[PDB]
Paper text:
Angiotensin-I-converting enzyme (ACE, EC 3.4.15.1) is a promiscuous zinc metallopeptidase with a number of substrates, including the vasoregulatory peptides angiotensin I and bradykinin, the anti-fibrotic agent N-acetyl-SDKP, the neurotransmitter substance P, and amyloid-β peptide. Here, we present the use of the Drosophila melanogaster ACE homologue, AnCE (which, in particular, shares enzymatic properties with cACE), as a model to study the structural basis of ACE inhibition. The active site is located at the centre of this channel, marked by the location of the catalytic zinc ion, which is coordinated by His367, His371, and Glu395.
The dipeptides with a C-terminal tryptophan (IW, VW, YW, RW) show an identical conformation of binding within the non-prime subsite, with the tryptophan residue occupying the S2 subsite. IW-1 isoleucine and VW-1 valine sit within the S1 subsite, forming a hydrophobic contact with Trp341. Due to the similarity of isoleucine and valine, the interactions within the S1′ subsite for VW-2 and IW-2 are conserved. The tryptophan binding within the S2′ subsite is conserved between IW-2, VW-2, YW-2, and RW-2, where the tryptophan side chain forms hydrophobic interactions with Phe441 and Tyr507, a π-stacking interaction with Phe511, and a H-bond with Gln266. Though VW has lower affinity for cACE and AnCE than IW, it shows higher selectivity when the affinities are compared to nACE, with VW having a Ki value of 151.6 µM compared to IW having a Ki value of 59.6 µM. The difference in affinity between IW and VW in AnCE is likely due to the extra carbon atom in isoleucine, which has an effect on the van der Waals interactions within both subsites, potentially further stabilising the dipeptide compared to VW. The changes within the S1 subsite could influence the more hydrophobic dipeptides IW-1 and VW-1, particularly due to the S1 subsite environment being less favourable for the isoleucine and valine. The S1′ and S2′ subsite changes between AnCE and cACE could result in higher affinity binding of the IW-2 and VW-2 dipeptides within these subsites due to the changes from AnCE-Thr364 and Gln266 to cACE-Val380 and Thr282, respectively, resulting in more hydrophobic pockets.
Author numbering: 19 to 614
Write the structure that this text describes.
């Protein structure tokens, strides 16, 4: 009708206004996140409250248009997105209380300090970097357990009453948008009613490999720590796995690697010896993208980013993140960067977000996000997969005197699995837990043990000490304290293998029927063929449902476990044999580390 013509002009104008108002909210959030004070908290929450109020006016104005009657799929999609208010649907007082609750949790988490194990006078150890360094480096099980407990008590238990209020307010918000719970609100971002089932099916296919890796790691840990510390048949004590949440185990690769007489890629020491800085690491990431004929970082990036931990003793959120300011070319990273191999991957991870932001900044505001949350998280990881290859690391002079025999290949495959397969059950449990609270499936009296129950069922790990319903451990993970959906990372770790396989084929770097070009040594550095595929997909933003974005990249429309399995198939074959040959116990008894 004539109405659809006016509507298109309504949208064009409203999109620009939302960008500009979001800009101002993002600036205040940035200011808080990079400098936590009471004054910046109030500024952030007051701006948010005002944007919330305007969003409600907008939702209500969508009803004045017959938008579901229109011809244009594109107009209807944009209107649909403006009806989805999220937390902004709350009454203004409930919204302000929710923001205050979220602030309390995120700043509790960011301000955690603990006492040194060897010196209880020295009480200024932060997660990043001091506690993370001990967890990743110490092989003293008693020190490890000490830091685990100190951290979980302060980051987790201390915000129980706040976490509860947040679940209530999150649930109320979802119901006001006519979702059953916050779980359905999160899942709506994947635009697919069978999405949970799809992930269950993929997870069930990779679980057997996970159990083989688990079994082997447990066997190797028993030889290091002995049977008093690690049982044969029980869940692995999580504090021994190189990471505070046992989400990835690559930091203990030096004690669990298949062939310890053969090389294991660890380039941290060479980075340090070649004088690498944070600045250099970001410049390398930048080079990687521009090498593929993708977009160079703008000057605002270099001028406004924070790529090193401030040295002025202020409080900030050190958890690494990427920020879109919704103008032109104002994109930033906040990373407390350290010169290590894992941090090099993180740098590429974060720069994948930046690239996505630049690729879609010509889109209308509602379309300036990922095709789905998982797509956003995968982009940088596709590059990190290349960066991590011995091929790439020899090219940039970080890996010296490396012979890629069959045993070094198994070592590298295993190292990657400790980051990529191990994480899958972990990532699944973070949202399974929250979903189950959001949906009202667990009584408040059982919330802590329901967490550790899932961590046992899916990952076969447990706490180093007995916990109970007096503790509350979930918020000790950043994203749980900060209310960041975690499924995006599960989706990412599956789909990034679909992107990488396809990028590798396009780059001439992978042929199944040619042993010179195996998937696990593919480097896509310099490939404009791969870059083109990325451009086609990333530039779409959220303008189409995600199957359409994937189709733009490689012609497929389906999320699949095929690629991640193909990548690790040589590992699976070897590891199955090695477990049988060493009579390794697979599976685990129920944990008894959480008392009701
Ligand atoms: C979540 O789900 C909620 C339901 O569970 C839903 O809430 C409902 O939304 C309806 C509109 O979205 C709303 O409808 C209005 O009802 C008015 C009368 O209802 C009152 O009495 C109820 C008991 O009987 C009370 O419980 C309520 O609290 C109400 O106070 C009507 O006056 C009103 O009507 C007018 O509006 C229609 C709209 O027509 C549409 O648009 C054009 C009009 O420009 C039409 O040409 C077109 O065909 C189309 O129909 C007009 O026909 C005309 O002006 C009417 O007079 C309207 O029906 C309903 O009251 C409300 N609550 C409940 C519980 O029913 C939420 O909307 C959902 N939330 C989200 C985010 O989607
Ligand atoms: C942190 O924020 C305060 C406002 O609460 C401001 O005055 C101060 O300059 C900021 N500090 C830094 C280092 O930016
Ligand atoms: C970069 O992009 C151009 C135009 O968009 C494309 O045609 C070309 O393949 C790319 N250039 C290089 C360096 O390969
Ligand atoms: Zn990310």
């Amino acid at each position: 009708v004539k109405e659809e013509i006016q509507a298109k002009e309504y949208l064009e104008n409203l999109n620009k206004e939302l960008a500009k108002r979001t800009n101002v909210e993002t600036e205040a959030a940035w200011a808080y996140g990079s400098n936590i004070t009471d004054e910046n908290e109030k500024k952030k929450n007051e701006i948010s409250a005002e944007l919330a109020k305007f969003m409600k006016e907008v939702a209500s104005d969508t009803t004045k248009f017959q938008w579901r009657s229109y011809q244009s799929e594109d107009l209807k999609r944009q209107f649909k997105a403006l009806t989805k208010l999220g937390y902004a649907a709350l009454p203004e007082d409930d919204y302000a209380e929710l923001l205050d609750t979220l602030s309390a949790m995120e700043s509790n988490f960011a301000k955690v300090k603990v006492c040194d194990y060897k010196d209880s006078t020295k009480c200024d150890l932060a997660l990043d970097p001091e506690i993370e360094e001990v967890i990743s480096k110490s092989r003293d099980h008693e020190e490890l357990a000490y830091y685990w407990r100190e951290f979980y008590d302060k980051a987790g238990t201390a915000v129980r009453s706040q976490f509860e209020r947040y679940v209530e307010l999150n649930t109320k918000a979802a119901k006001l948008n006519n979702f059953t719970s916050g779980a359905e609100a999160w899942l709506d971002e994947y635009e697919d009613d069978t999405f949970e089932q799809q992930l269950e099916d993929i997870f069930a296919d990779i679980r057997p490999l996970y159990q083989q890796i688990h079994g082997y790691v447990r066997f190797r840990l028993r030889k290091h720590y002995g049977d008093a510390v690690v049982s044969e048949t029980g869940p692995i004590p999580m504090h021994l796995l190189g990471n505070m949440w046992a989400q990835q185990w690559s930091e203990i690769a030096d004690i669990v690697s298949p062939f310890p007489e053969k090389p294991l890629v660890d380039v941290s020491a060479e980075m340090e010896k070649q004088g690498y800085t944070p600045l250099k690491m970001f410049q390398m990431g930048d080079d990687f993208f521009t090498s593929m004929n993708l977009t160079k970082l703008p000057q605002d990036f270099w001028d406004k980013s924070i790529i090193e931990k401030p040295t002025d003793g202020r409080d900030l959120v050190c958890h690494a993140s990427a920020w879109d300011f919704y103008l032109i070319d104002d994109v930033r990273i906040k990373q407390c960067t350290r010169v290590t191999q894992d941090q090099l991957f993180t740098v590429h991870h974060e720069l994948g977000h930046i690239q996505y932001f630049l690729q879609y900044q010509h889109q209308p505001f509602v379309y300036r996000t990922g095709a789905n949350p998982g797509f956003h998280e995968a982009v940088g990881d596709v590059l990190s997969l290349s960066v991590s290859t011995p091929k790439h690391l020899e090219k940039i002079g970080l890996l010296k005197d490396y012979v890629r025999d069959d045993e070094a290949r198994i070592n590298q495959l295993f190292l990657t699995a400790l980051d990529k397969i191990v994480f899958l059950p972990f990532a699944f449990t973070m949202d399974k837990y929250r979903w189950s609270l959001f949906r009202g499936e667990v009584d408040k009296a059982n919330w802590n043990c329901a967490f550790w129950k899932l961590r046992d069922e899916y990952s076969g790990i447990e706490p180093p000490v007995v916990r109970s319903e007096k503790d509350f451990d979930a918020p000790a993970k950043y994203h749980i304290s900060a209310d960041v959906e975690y499924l995006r990372y599960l989706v990412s770790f599956i789909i990034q293998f679909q992107f990488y396989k396809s990028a590798c084929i396009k780059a001439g770097q992978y042929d199944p029927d040619n042993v010179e070009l195996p998937l696990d040594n593919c480097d896509i550095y310099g490939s404009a063929a791969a870059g083109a595929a990325f451009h086609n997909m990333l530039s779409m933003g959220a303008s189409k449902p995600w199957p359409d974005a994937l189709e733009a990249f490689n012609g497929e429309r389906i999320m699949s476990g095929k690629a991640i399995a193909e990548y690790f198939e040589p590992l699976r074959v070897w590891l199955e044999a090695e477990n049988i040959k060493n009579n390794v116990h697979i599976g685990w008894t129920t944990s008894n580390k959480c008392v009701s």
